[PDB]
Design a protein around this ligand. Structure first.
Ligand SMILES: [K+]
Ligand SMILES: [K+]
Ligand SMILES: [K+]
Ligand SMILES: [K+]
Lengths: 93, 93, 93, 93
């Protein structure tokens, strides 16, 4: 759970950075910037938002390489250290 | 296989929740809501459907973080506990 | 390598099924059907092609769940049993 | 770290090949070609750029199968051999 808290914090910080970047450089509303950051790093990539400027494209390349690892790290421990135990506890006779 | 049944149920429940959410808040036909939920959680993300409302964007962020884990959990055991054995059995001299 | 050949065959068969399905039901040229099948199962999902009919949407949900496992299985052994050794061999003093 | 350097080089080479291919055959500006290559191999797939020619579609199928493995290989060691240690070092009393 201490591991989970660190991943949670790191993930929050990563998403804040994307929110601030895309809101500024790509002109997105903050909520659309956050949404886009999440859709990007979880590799869903709907493409309803995508960077139009070269600065945005370049940041996006780096953001993906740096962020995918910890976002999926976080997701994995969420699933294994949080969701898994609660599901098991729901089953117990 | 008992593990497989729990993942199957959990996956069904997750997809039902997305179906109901997107049908209501985003106004999708139920079938398009289900399809979109699956396209989202499996991280394919075609983007033919994507949330237009802030409520939908916010739900989508959370749905992704919560759902990716069990959807890929389910997929993994489907592949390893169901598809794998049947493929092996097809090969046997 | 025998494992690699089975995954290769299974992957080919999966892509043929998608090629035939999308060419017929969704009216795609065979090459676009194959391309779309690959873009779908590798979870890239550009969305330049996406199913427009309910039959296509329903097939796509099932195709994703069934196909992701073996496509990524194949990719993983391609990377570990084929690409890895060749890269190592290129390095050897 | 020697492993990390090899993956880094291999990833660079893979992205250069995509940059050159899409710039030429699909007529993209080099920066858009690089961006698209990364968006493709990391499986984000926004679809703002996607191949329009059959040559491009065929290359893309092969590029995905060959490139996903080493791109995710690189990402994984970046996360585990580079980001992980630095994060731990930031925590130390
Ligand atoms: K993906
Ligand atoms: K995707
Ligand atoms: K897309
Ligand atoms: K996508």
């Amino acid at each position: 759970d201490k591991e989970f808290q660190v991943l949670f914090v790191l993930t929050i910080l990563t998403l804040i950075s994307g929110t601030i970047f895309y809101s500024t450089v790509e002109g997105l509303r903050p909520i659309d910037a956050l949404y886009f950051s999440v859709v990007t790093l979880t590799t869903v990539g709907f493409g309803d938002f995508s960077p139009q400027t070269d600065f945005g494209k370049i940041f996006t390349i780096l953001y993906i390489f740096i962020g995918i690892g910890l976002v999926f790290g976080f997701i994995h421990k969420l699933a294994v250290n949080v969701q898994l135990p609660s599901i098991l506890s729901n089953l117990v006779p």
